[PDB]
Design an enzyme around this catalytic site. Structure first.
Site, PDB file in Angstrom:
ATOM      1  N   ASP A   1      45.904  41.467  47.139  1.00 62.26           N
ATOM      2  CA  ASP A   1      45.465  42.416  46.117  1.00 62.26           C
ATOM      3  C   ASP A   1      45.484  43.856  46.635  1.00 62.26           C
ATOM      4  OD1 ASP A   1      44.386  43.392  43.631  1.00 62.26           O
ATOM      5  OD2 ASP A   1      42.394  43.400  44.524  1.00 62.26           O
TER       6      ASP A   1
ATOM      7  N   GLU B   1      43.740  41.539  36.986  1.00 59.24           N
ATOM      8  CA  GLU B   1      42.844  40.441  37.335  1.00 59.24           C
ATOM      9  C   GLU B   1      42.680  39.470  36.173  1.00 59.24           C
ATOM     10  OE1 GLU B   1      43.466  42.346  40.228  1.00 59.24           O
ATOM     11  OE2 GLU B   1      42.128  43.713  39.194  1.00 59.24           O
TER      12      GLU B   1
ATOM     13  N   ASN C   1      48.950  45.368  41.641  1.00 53.46           N
ATOM     14  CA  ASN C   1      49.122  44.033  42.196  1.00 53.46           C
ATOM     15  C   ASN C   1      49.681  43.030  41.213  1.00 53.46           C
ATOM     16  OD1 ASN C   1      46.253  44.386  41.078  1.00 53.46           O
ATOM     17  ND2 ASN C   1      46.263  42.165  41.405  1.00 53.46           N
TER      18      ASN C   1
HETATM   19  O1  PQQ Z   1      44.259  45.127  38.444  1.00 52.05           O
HETATM   20  C1  PQQ Z   1      43.906  46.014  37.629  1.00 52.05           C
HETATM   21  O2  PQQ Z   1      44.598  46.254  36.615  1.00 52.05           O
HETATM   22  C2  PQQ Z   1      42.725  46.906  37.936  1.00 52.05           C
HETATM   23  C3  PQQ Z   1      41.881  47.824  37.279  1.00 52.05           C
HETATM   24  C4  PQQ Z   1      40.925  48.473  38.024  1.00 52.05           C
HETATM   25  C5  PQQ Z   1      40.291  49.318  36.940  1.00 52.05           C
HETATM   26  O3  PQQ Z   1      40.865  49.332  35.819  1.00 52.05           O
HETATM   27  O4  PQQ Z   1      39.224  49.983  37.142  1.00 52.05           O
HETATM   28  C6  PQQ Z   1      40.805  48.237  39.374  1.00 52.05           C
HETATM   29  C7  PQQ Z   1      41.651  47.306  40.013  1.00 52.05           C
HETATM   30  N1  PQQ Z   1      42.619  46.676  39.281  1.00 52.05           N
HETATM   31  C8  PQQ Z   1      41.547  47.045  41.487  1.00 52.05           C
HETATM   32  O5  PQQ Z   1      42.300  46.258  42.058  1.00 52.05           O
HETATM   33  C9  PQQ Z   1      40.545  47.750  42.221  1.00 52.05           C
HETATM   34  O6  PQQ Z   1      40.443  47.579  43.407  1.00 52.05           O
HETATM   35  C10 PQQ Z   1      39.632  48.719  41.546  1.00 52.05           C
HETATM   36  C11 PQQ Z   1      38.615  49.498  42.032  1.00 52.05           C
HETATM   37  C12 PQQ Z   1      38.099  50.202  40.947  1.00 52.05           C
HETATM   38  C13 PQQ Z   1      37.001  51.214  41.012  1.00 52.05           C
HETATM   39  O7  PQQ Z   1      37.131  52.147  40.182  1.00 52.05           O
HETATM   40  O8  PQQ Z   1      36.062  51.199  41.854  1.00 52.05           O
HETATM   41  N2  PQQ Z   1      38.803  49.882  39.804  1.00 52.05           N
HETATM   42  C14 PQQ Z   1      39.750  48.956  40.167  1.00 52.05           C
HETATM   43 MG    MG Z   2      43.697  44.797  40.808  1.00 54.77          MG
END
Ligand code: PQQ
Ligand code: MG
Ligand code: PQQ
Ligand code: MG
Lengths: 596, 66, 596, 66
Positions: C303, C177, C261
């Protein structure tokens, strides 16, 4: 309040912090007893979403549990038929600067409840660290009124529970460590109007004396002493805040509480008896005027803040006469029992014989006979003084079994070294003026940082202990007793425990998520008896863990006494509810399930 | 100073050996600012006034306005 | 790691987040079973002393439980013989600025364990939000090494659990992100030396391809696609971070995980298939070189970060041939089952038929046939797209019962509106470029903010669901299954639940202090079977509550979907441990009592 | 664009109706700063160098110095 009196008779309710106006913490519920307490297990639980110390305990009334937190002092209401749903919340907006003028963690000792009449519906009443008192509609959580009762810019905060009697809300005061002159205030629950406000020091016009003040004990002192036992205007910043507990007798229509320590801790900066700090009060409810006032600790040298719990009882004295009494385990290590109509001193016994600042309290003169070897003064470091400033007893709300005629005291076994220093008063700044080092007392294990607690069962007339038990850490949070023959209390190392009311034998314990500094409470709902307790360690003993301190004199001397806490608990915040076999509304697994 | 020797009812304070009966002008003189000493009372009087205004308006309108 | 394989066979241990290298989360322990699970109640508990989301679960090895927390990622060790004593703690110092580049709460998915040999003792391995990987001595908690694996100044963080196989520590990456190019890295546990590092996009020299990469499926694509499916240098900030889970087959010496993603979320700013984001990998352990890679979601428009759990099994396919398989419930709503030797696509079924971005996955071509009506693009507001960006499945670690041949899937029923917008890339700043509104799917109750979870039992060969059950909220934390015929999981509204493994019937539930976003785990100690679970709600679904947000599109679209959570839970942080009748070491009430 | 038409193995992307095959020079040109794009690689290389130094010293002294 007539309705509160009637409500407190029912085991379905726990309508005030002390359970009843007498502060007995005594339940006639017997479903949980000596023979089955080992079957006690959690029924359900609730996280408050905040950390730091969780003092006081929930209230239960009208089938609803009411839960308070430390700063920012959120309130939650829970319908006991479906404990997983938050019926309502109230989340105050406060200046975070309020945190900085709290001496001893951002604790709050709980809610009060006013049952309603034909002019206003029932209210939940809360205090805020930033000084406000807030009345909320009990059913909806919506603000009914909000008044200012302290200004953090001059070091005032509020940590005490409000106290409801008749149609008054009474709120005390905090900040003696910042030179705040103690004041106690009553507000009309219907209108928010201030009804009276009286101070702990200064002219009699400020202190509020009934025309018959100490008529039965003129040797306690009467007029003019709120200034004459001070030098010049030192009383204006003279402490005496009342941040502990109250008791109330509806027949006498008097309420009872203790005023706190004089400021600063440096005794040399305030010659004189410093009245009326450290005083047991009996005040008329409607006018607030004092009918009696007994100063426990004249010219305090130790921060033995005289705010502790008041427990009312009726017992025959050594002469066989039935007496209406109050019993009061003070920070200074003496358990005071007075006639609660006359103020007469009935007994004044050490809660542990290692107390050494005083030889004995003379019941005829009413004076504590000081041992100069354990006083404090500029230019001297006093060593092995008992109690510590933290007290042989602090803010814990204890209990009295009226059938056994025993008080169950959660005690600290703590002593200290102490050395004062000179400092200026600046409003809004700390005004302590002593360096302190607290540690486990002689009966504990000072080298290993443990054995700093006791639980004792006490008779106020004979002065004898039915039993005495040692605890690993100070028993900070108070006690609750039941007709099941059980005494419940929580510990700093994270247990709730039950002891045999007659022998003190440990019958049960459960490892909570965090240490306990509030009292157990109990209530019966749909035929099931529950025991609930706050958890979340903090307050004075745990400032080392909470604020990451290491210097043994840090935390006003607490840090060096409690370094071992962190090996047994971390911070937390929540309520744990117990029942026989963990019986719970969610035994019906469909309760709260999606789409029903 | 053992607390048992009393000037009057409710007044039993004595200076410890080596210490003065009065500390003004002594090494222990606090030299308090009267202006600082009065600030608490000023703050409380101000809050009382603001509370009273709220109470009057509450009586008038039936809803609390802080 | 041979010793890890052996340790994982015992019910006394839970030696990695996935329980075993196949990620089955399956226990052969039968003490607790479908007919006595109603007797489960808390044995003991532990507060972590921190708030925000508590993902992952504890480890248990040789009589000790190891517990991790969200930021600042503290570690606690506890000897199960006396659960109230903290054997050791490790509390990292980190720049609090790390919090600001965490997209989705400051969660951490847990510890790993390396069992020791003749050159180094056993080690606990942890990740820190600020990007470090740390090896601690398992016995003492003292640091053995600490390496940098991310720089928050360019948007990198670490939330994933490290993964130990043989003598390697493997760590993923976070920050798509913020335009972070995904990288996966291995360190030697003895020396801290970096053994390999491979990227998700860029030239093949960066991606790490075996000469036989996709030999059995050349139509998946082979060489040069890490740049040729991008325009110019857009791959440099192209996402593909891997922050989910791994599985490992010791016989093949291959490990498996998914890459995430592509960045930004704005699809119009990155024309092309964007390989190798959204890819299922089978990589050689010692070299890291990829033997196969299957892109689930070419040119992501939603995503659907492809990081979810891998569960290994051996089953007969539709032709009766025994296959070595991986099964993988993707964010995009498809459950992928591949031959884990060849990479061959065996089945690819919708975990709920409301998924609509894809009509079906063609097993011959390997391609998801897109429904253009539910794509995204500049200038367009896409409506009622299923799944939401949050997925029909997110980070929860689920389970597989190898006797029933059923996967127990903790599923989200969430759909969305979506509209991209143009934005620049600046290193260290967010790089999302879409406005999103997530809500409960068609089978739930959008208008009342609920019905956003499901639990389903799935056969990977037939594609049939043995049962399907709705949940009030998304089942975020994963599932654990036992040969007692039980499927355990926690819920966002604060329950741990058990369903019948054969029918899905709800058998038991208990109200924990806070919502759950980690998985249950189980272990046996001195003959008693225990079930433990983290509580403390947070992660993506609870950002509204955790960060006090109210705009429905806030929290990357999540806030509008989970407004009702706060009526059922507050923040928290701890571990709750269960056993039949709440049997506990503290049933011996003398355990841990002073003295001394 | 339904994802089923592939110019090569592993490359099936198509522009949506009315969109260009390449966005450089279009209204959708991201105009990325090439020096911004290089920053995370630089950061990763710097960390690799520092870790390697720690590892070499660790081999020599037997105690990790960050
Ligand atoms: O794009 C990323 O590198 C990254 C990291 C994380 C994260 O590190 O916790 C999530 C996501 N993406 C993501 O897309 C996502 O839906 C998500 C949910 C969570 C959570 O633990 O509830 N972390 C993350
Ligand atoms: Mg993500
Ligand atoms: O002097 C004061 O006015 C004031 C306030 C408090 C407080 O407000 O919590 C304490 C004290 N004093 C005090 O002396 C003390 O020992 C103490 C302990 C605690 C606690 O809850 O653990 N509060 C306080
Ligand atoms: Mg005090």
């Amino acid at each position: 309040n007539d309705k509160l009196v009637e409500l407190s008779k029912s085991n379905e309710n726990w309508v005030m912090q002390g359970k009843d106006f007498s502060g007995t913490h005594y339940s006639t519920a017997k479903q949980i007893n000596k023979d089955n307490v080992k079957k006690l297990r959690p029924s359900w639980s609730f996280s408050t979403g905040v950390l730091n110390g969780h003092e006081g305990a929930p209230l239960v009334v009208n089938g609803t549990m009411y839960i308070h937190t430390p700063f920012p002092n959120n309130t939650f209401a829970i319908d006991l038929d479906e404990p997983g749903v938050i019926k309502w919340e109230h989340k105050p907006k406060q200046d975070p600067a309020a945190r900085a003028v709290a001496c001893c963690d951002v604790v709050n000792r709980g809610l009060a409840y006013w049952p309603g009449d034909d002019k206003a519906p029932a209210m939940i009443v809360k205090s805020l660290l930033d000084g406000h008192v807030v009345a909320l509609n009990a059913e909806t959580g919506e603000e009914y009124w909000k008044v200012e009762n302290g200004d953090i810019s001059v070091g005032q905060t509020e940590t005490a529970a409000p106290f409801v009697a008749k149609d008054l809300v009474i709120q005390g005061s905090s900040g003696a460590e910042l030179g705040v002159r103690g004041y106690v205030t009553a507000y009309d629950i219907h209108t928010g109007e201030m009804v009276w406000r009286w101070y702990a020091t200064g002219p009699d016009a400020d202190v509020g004396l009934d025309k018959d003040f100490n008529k039965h004990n003129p040797h306690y002192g009467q007029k003019g002493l709120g200034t004459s036992t001070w030098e010049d205007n030192a009383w204006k910043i003279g402490g005496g805040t009342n941040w502990g507990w109250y008791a109330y007798d509806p027949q006498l229509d008097m309420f009872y509480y203790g005023s706190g320590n004089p400021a600063p801790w440096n005794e040399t900066m305030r010659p004189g008896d410093n009245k009326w700090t450290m005083t047991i009060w009996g005040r008329d409810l409607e006018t607030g005027l004092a009918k009696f006032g007994y100063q426990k600790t004249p010219h305090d040298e130790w921060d033995y803040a005289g705010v502790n719990v008041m427990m009312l009882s009726e017992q025959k004295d050594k002469n066989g006469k039935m007496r209406k009494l109050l019993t009061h385990p003070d920070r200074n290590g003496i358990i005071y029992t007075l006639d609660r109509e006359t103020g007469d001193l009935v007994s004044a016994n050490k809660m542990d014989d290692t107390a050494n600042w005083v030889k004995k309290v003379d019941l005829e003169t009413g004076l504590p006979i000081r041992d100069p070897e354990y006083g404090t003064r500029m230019g001297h470091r006093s060593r092995d003084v008992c109690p510590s400033a933290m007290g042989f007893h602090n803010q814990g709300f204890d209990s009295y079994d009226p059938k056994r005629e025993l008080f169950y005291l959660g005690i600290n076994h703590l002593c200290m070294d102490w050395e004062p220093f000179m400092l200026p008063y600046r409003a809004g700044q700390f005004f302590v003026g002593a360096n302190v080092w607290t540690y486990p007392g002689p009966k504990g294990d000072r080298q290993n940082g443990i054995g700093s607690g006791q639980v004792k069962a006490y008779n106020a007339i004979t002065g004898e202990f039915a039993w005495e038990k040692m605890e690993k850490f100070s028993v900070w949070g108070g006690t609750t007793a039941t007709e099941g023959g059980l005494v419940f209390y929580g510990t700093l190392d994270g247990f709730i425990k039950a002891r045999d009311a007659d022998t003190g034998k440990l019958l049960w314990k459960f490892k909570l998520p965090s240490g306990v500094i509030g009292h157990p409470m109990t209530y019966t709902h749909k035929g099931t008896q529950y025991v609930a307790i706050n958890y979340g360690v903090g307050g004075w003993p745990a400032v080392g863990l909470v604020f990451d301190l290491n210097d043994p004199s840090a935390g006003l001397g607490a840090v060096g006494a409690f370094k071992e806490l962190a090996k047994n608990t971390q911070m937390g915040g929540g309520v744990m509810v117990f029942s026989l076999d963990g019986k719970s509304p969610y035994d019906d697994v469909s309760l709260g399930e999606y789409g029903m | 100073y053992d607390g048992t020797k009393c000037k009057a009812a409710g007044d039993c304070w004595e200076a410890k050996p080596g210490f003065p009966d009065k500390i003004k002008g002594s090494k222990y003189d606090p030299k308090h600012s009267e202006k600082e000493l009065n600030k608490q009372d000023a703050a409380l009087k101000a809050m009382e006034k603001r509370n009273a205004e709220r109470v009057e308006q509450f009586k008038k309108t039936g809803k609390w306005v802080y």
